[PDB]
UniProtKB/Swiss-Prot annotation, chains A, B:
Subcellular localization, as worded in the UniProt entry: Mitochondrion matrix
Gene: LONP1
Name of the protein this chain belongs to: Lon protease homolog, mitochondrial
Expression across tissues: Duodenum, heart, lung and liver, but not thymus.
Disease: CODAS syndrome: A rare syndrome characterized by the combination of cerebral, ocular, dental, auricular, and skeletal features. These include developmental delay, craniofacial anomalies, cataracts, ptosis, median nasal groove, delayed tooth eruption, hearing loss, short stature, delayed epiphyseal ossification, metaphyseal hip dysplasia, and vertebral coronal clefts.
Domain topic, free-text comment: The Lon N-terminal domains are crucial for the overall structure of the protein, maintaining it in a conformation allowing its proper functioning.
Residue numbers of the full-length protein present here: 415 to 463 of 959
Described purpose of this protein according to its UniProt entry: ATP-dependent serine protease that mediates the selective degradation of misfolded, unassembled or oxidatively damaged polypeptides as well as certain short-lived regulatory proteins in the mitochondrial matrix. Endogenous substrates include mitochondrial steroidogenic acute regulatory (StAR) protein, DELE1, helicase Twinkle (TWNK) and the large ribosomal subunit protein MRPL32/bL32m. MRPL32/bL32m is protected from degradation by LONP1 when it is bound to a nucleic acid (RNA), but TWNK is not. May also have a chaperone function in the assembly of inner membrane protein complexes.
Domain of life: Eukaryota
Length: 49, 49
């Protein structure tokens, strides 16, 4: 939530396209499914940022 | 199955050839064996999309 929500309020200011909206949100969903420890999750985390 | 289910209603409208039908079916099952988080699952996910 921490990183996700600072980026979410980020997202709340800039008007993202609905395409990019669902992409960032589903990538956030994959963040939630991906475990925090995985290097795969570090890649998607760096990607989210 | 969530992703495969939106895919399968998709396919329920447009009429696929039985060739590509069976191909997507075996790929769908092959996806279903695949882990929910594996990198190759993401590849076959994007591919099935």
């Amino acid at each position: 939530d921490a990183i996700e929500e600072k980026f979410r309020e980020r997202l709340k200011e800039l008007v993202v396209p609905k395409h990019v909206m669902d992409v960032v949100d589903e990538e956030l969903s994959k963040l939630g499914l991906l475990d925090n420890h995985s290097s795969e999750f570090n890649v998607t985390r760096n990607y989210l940022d």
